[PDB]
DNA sequence: CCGACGACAGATAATTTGTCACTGTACAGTAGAATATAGATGCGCATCTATATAGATGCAAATTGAGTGGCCTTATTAAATGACTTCTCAACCAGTCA
């Protein structure tokens, strides 16, 4: 048996703006979870796989943000900060960037995805929806693991170069 | 002159050989045979041995069939096919017309 440990993770602290889809999968990097093993985790099954493809077409529920809440010890009122506000169209297709932040803070941030934005007014940039070298489209949120180009291994914050 | 010894010759009993008469003795059924022992050799019967096990057992892979666990897009409209549920199913009197 133990000697007087209290049950854990590596819990992360979630950054200023991120996308559910994008801490989901650091949540399952700092644990070593596949997405289904996440969702079987926090009891609400294969729902976990749909969340990291922005595949919200019945909206994540009060009860099934709860039950992740459980797991990633933030609770219900946080997470629902990491999704659209009601009546916020997002777009699920073009996964898209701004790079020039991605320096200033590592994470895919959810209003990139809204049918509104067209540049960051941090620094009055153009999104981008592409690598501006290679002309890849970008990875899901949750497997932006290295921070860079999957095809041409640019980095994110070198594409603050690129862009506009 | 007397005494002792050798040469030569002569005579003689001992020795050997032969002949002759009287005699003690074997021929008479008879010693190969009996009776111990040691020492070597051979046939028979028992008393071990050394080999030869096949059956039983323990064990260790080599699958082999039978499990169990883990991972997965979703909401409207329209047409098609196959089904379910509900509803309905008076009859003669009163006003024209050729």
């Known amino acids: 048996e133990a000697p007087d440990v209290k049950p854990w993770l590596f819990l992360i602290k979630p950054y200023e703006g991120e996308s559910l889809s994008h801490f989901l999968g650091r949540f399952r990097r700092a644990n070593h979870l596949s997405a289904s093993g996440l969702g079987t985790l926090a009891g609400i099954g294969a729902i976990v796989a749909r969340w990291e493809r922005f595949h919200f077409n ?41 790079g020039a932040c991605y320096a200033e803070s590592p994470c895919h941030r959810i209003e990139w995805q809204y ?43 070198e594409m603050a170069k690129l862009q506009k």
Do not use: T, Y
């Open 115 to 157: 049918k509104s934005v067209w540049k960051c007014d941090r620094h009055q940039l153009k999104i981008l929806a592409k690598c501006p070298n290679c002309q890849a489209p970008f990875k899901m949120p949750a497997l932006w693991e290295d921070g860079c180009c999957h095809r041409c291994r640019m980095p994110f914050a």
């Open 58 to 98: 019945p909206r994540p529920s009060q009860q099934e943000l709860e039950a992740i809440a459980s797991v990633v010890e933030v609770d219900a009122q946080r997470l629902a900060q990491m999704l659209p506000p009601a009546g916020v169209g997002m777009q699920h297709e073009p996964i898209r960037l701004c």
